[PDB]
């Protein structure tokens, strides 16, 4: 593709949210559950967004070098490869599939 | 003022929230806080959102009557008037003082 640096997410299933946060804690991020990602919603490095099914582009900051991104399936279900650590200075392109699985291409 | 039915903010104070809820349980609703908010930030009628300091508006959706709007101050301070009721058929203007004080206008 020709896309430039950025975060891009093709999605299946309706409903799904992502939760974006600059500058994470990588011990943080290891340990990570849904629970505890939404304990840290009011802070002002971290944003929950709603996905459209289809095409999604979201906007990194290009001075923040590091973000955690965290896909949430609705319905409180899990999927295995649910959570990444990716960079503004990258083409950072994901997936849902129908399954729920996760690629990131 | 010559807006048309929906939500306007006026915001003074850096790093404030919104939460806006659609369709919102009233009972809840009297009971919240900070904290029973936060568990339903994945929930498909729920958005967190960033203020900007200045003038914001956000999107009602004219076919859902009502909503439920919570600020949410920073550092996990609270302020007496932080949560609404309000429709999508009304003008909804809100400031946030310096003083950290909300005015529905
Ligand atoms: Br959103
Ligand atoms: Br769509
Ligand atoms: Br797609
Ligand atoms: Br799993
Ligand atoms: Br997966
Ligand atoms: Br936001
Ligand atoms: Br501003
Ligand atoms: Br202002
Ligand atoms: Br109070
Ligand atoms: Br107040």
Redesign the interface.
């Given at each position: 593709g020709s896309h430039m640096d950025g975060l891009y997410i093709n999605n299946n299933i309706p409903?799904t949210?992502i939760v974006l946060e600059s500058k994470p804690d990588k011990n943080i991020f290891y340990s990570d559950n849904?629970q505890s990602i939404?304990?840290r919603?009011?802070d002002?490095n971290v944003?929950?967004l709603?996905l459209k099914t289809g095409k999604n582009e979201f906007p990194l900051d290009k001075d923040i070098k590091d973000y955690a991104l965290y896909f949430?399936l609705?319905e409180?279900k899990k999927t295995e490869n649910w959570k990444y650590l990716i960079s503004s200075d990258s083409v950072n392109e994901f997936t849902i599939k129908n399954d729920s699985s996760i690629e990131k291409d």
């Open positions: 409903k949210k849904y939404s304990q919603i009011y002002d944003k929950v709603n949430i609705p409180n």
